[PDB]
């Protein structure tokens, strides 16, 4: 899990969600795309 | 960085930045980067935009540059009492009216051209946009 | 041929036995013996050519019995043999290597058209003609 100020859809199994006001990106294919801020 | 040979004055007054554009088109080619916000470009940014514009398109194709300095902003060094004269020549900056194109790109499809400019806009302190070609 | 478990596409060197640098463990990833596949295939090089890069389609059952399906040379190295110029592209649209007509190329296209998988014979030749313009070569007409 990385913090950023810019999430970017990195994988193709990257998903975008907005759990509790914060834009999370969860790649179930890959832990190395997991990020939140934005 | 691109800087003038054989100027008339080394030092230039301050000045402001009011007004709108002069060059408001794509003129030399078809694909350009047009300034929507108003801000100041120094020359190294103009070098670093182009230098990180070649490897976006892998040096192929042609790129046209419309702009240049000759607003020499001077800046005092560290630790001065205010005024013994004007500051020393430090670095070139190039004023921008809103609506001027900055780089013009040709020899490449629009498909890589809309993708090569997104790496450029963060090498400029202003906001830009991408304009394609207009007839008449 | 059974289902794909240890199915590969292999044999970079037909006339030379045990292609050890490029292929190497490419059959050896299962651990399958090469000492009997050579003596089975030395018995099947009696009627076909030698010293040519001819690939193989090899499938084994669950009980160590293996099966090959050998074929003619593929079309992109057919320029090296039917024209006699052992060369490649470098940059293929801007390259010259040679030129051969389709009327000279068809003499092996009698021997391979029974062996390939197609439904028009003059269109399996077009698997070499469009190959030829894609591998640096031009064809006479």
């Amino acid at each position: 899990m990385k913090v950023r100020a810019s999430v970017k859809k990195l994988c193709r199994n990257c998903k975008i969600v907005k759990r509790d006001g914060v834009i999370r990106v969860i790649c179930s294919a890959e832990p190395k795309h997991k990020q939140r801020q934005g | 960085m691109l800087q003038p040979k054989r100027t008339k004055f080394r030092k230039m007054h301050k000045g402001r930045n009011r007004g709108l554009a002069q060059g408001t088109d794509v003129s030399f080619g078809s694909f350009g980067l047009k300034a929507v916000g108003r801000g100041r470009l120094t020359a190294r940014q103009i070098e670093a935009a182009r230098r990180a514009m070649t490897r976006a398109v892998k040096r192929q194709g042609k790129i046209w540059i419309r702009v240049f300095p000759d607003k020499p902003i001077t800046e005092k060094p560290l630790a001065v009492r205010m005024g013994k004269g004007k500051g020393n020549v430090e670095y070139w900056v190039a004023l921008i009216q809103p609506g001027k194109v900055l780089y013009e790109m040709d020899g490449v499809p629009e498909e890589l051209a809309r993708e090569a400019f997104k790496l450029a806009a963060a090498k400029l302190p202003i906001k830009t946009t991408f304009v394609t070609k207009t007839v008449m | 041929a059974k289902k794909v478990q240890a199915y590969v596409k292999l044999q970079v060197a037909a006339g030379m036995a045990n292609p050890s640098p490029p292929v190497g463990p490419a059959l050896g990833q299962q651990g399958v013996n090469i000492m009997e596949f050579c003596k089975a295939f030395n018995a099947k090089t009696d009627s076909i050519e030698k010293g040519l890069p001819i690939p193989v389609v090899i499938t084994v059952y669950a009980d160590r019995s293996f099966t090959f399906v050998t074929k003619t040379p593929p079309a992109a190295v057919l320029l090296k043999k039917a024209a006699g110029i052992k060369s490649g592209s470098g940059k293929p649209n801007k390259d010259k290597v040679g030129k051969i007509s389709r009327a000279q190329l068809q003499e092996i296209a009698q021997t391979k058209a029974a062996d390939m998988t197609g439904a028009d014979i003059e269109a399996m030749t077009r698997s070499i003609e469009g190959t030829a313009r894609s591998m640096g070569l031009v064809v006479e007409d």
């Binding site: - | - | 050890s20 640098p21 190497g24 463990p25 050896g28 651990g31 090469i34 000492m35």
Partner: protein, 286 residues
């Protein structure tokens, strides 16, 4: 007899006692071998396997009180030349000590091929017209050969050469048994820098074994250490990795290879030839 450790026990002191006891441990078995280096002034000790190599020195810990540390070969690797220059001059005019001391020689050392026979180093005498007489033919070679030792590319000897000199001048009593001899050295020292000559490396060939398919395990650890993978020798089961890796990236080779292969390997290596070294890896030499 293919696994190895070494010694650098405070770099001179303990080596004055301990190596004799290796010979006192060499009557125990004829497999107790050591590799003597004078490139590094070291003795690289072998063993047998996991059980022997740590109790090789552990017997010397209690019964001899040594301070041995397992070391690495740090070597001279080779050097060679690149291009030639046909105008240097042996211009000295010293005066004291006797009658006179003048010399003059024009020094031309020529680049031969890196793949050569033992005729790859020579003294090809191409003098003309009696500008230098034939009673100088060994000493002009003697002044030439003396700069091979401390050649100032961080001090290494250098091969694949050939010298073809042209021009000089000599007096009645000035030119001596020494006058050309220093003129054929310090001037030949100035023919040395201007070629941009090359640093080298002692190329060895790889023969690490593999059960049937283990190329997916070694593909890092030798490719960091300069692997030129030229294939395999293929059998029914046992296949063997064959590449080209020089000596001085076996820093921690013997004690880290079994960390990779699930604890199952036994390597061997053999040294062939001279190839070159670029300045990125030649930076780590001085």
């Amino acid at each position: 007899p293919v696994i190895s450790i070494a010694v650098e026990p405070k770099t001179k002191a303990d080596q004055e006692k301990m190596g004799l006891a290796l010979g006192r441990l060499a009557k125990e078995d004829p497999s107790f071998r050591v590799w003597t280096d004078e490139e590094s002034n070291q003795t690289i000790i072998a063993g047998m396997g996991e059980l022997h190599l740590d109790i090789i020195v552990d017997r010397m810990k209690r019964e001899f009180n040594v301070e041995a540390n397992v070391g690495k070969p740090q070597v001279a690797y080779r050097e060679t030349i690149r291009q030639k220059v046909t105008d240097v001059e042996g211009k000295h005019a010293k005066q004291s000590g006797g009658r006179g001391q003048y010399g003059h020689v024009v020094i031309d050392m020529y680049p031969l091929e890196p793949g050569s026979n033992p005729k790859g180093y020579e003294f090809i005498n191409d003098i003309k017209g009696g500008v230098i007489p034939g009673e100088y033919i060994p000493a002009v070679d003697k002044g030439i050969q003396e700069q091979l030792k401390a050649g100032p590319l961080a001090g290494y000897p250098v091969v694949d050469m050939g010298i073809r000199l042209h021009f000089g001048s000599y007096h009645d009593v000035d030119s001596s048994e020494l006058a050309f001899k220093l003129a054929a050295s310090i001037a030949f020292k100035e023919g040395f820098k201007k070629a941009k000559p090359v640093l080298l490396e002692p190329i060895m060939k790889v023969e690490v074994e593999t059960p049937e398919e283990n190329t997916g395990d070694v593909i890092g650890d030798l490719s960091r250490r300069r692997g030129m993978l030229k294939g395999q020798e293929s059998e029914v089961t046992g296949v063997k990795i064959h590449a080209e890796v020089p000596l001085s990236e076996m820093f921690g080779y013997a004690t880290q290879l079994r960390s990779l292969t699930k604890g199952r390997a036994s390597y061997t290596m053999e040294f062939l030839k001279y190839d070159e070294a670029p300045s990125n890896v030649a930076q780590a030499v001085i």
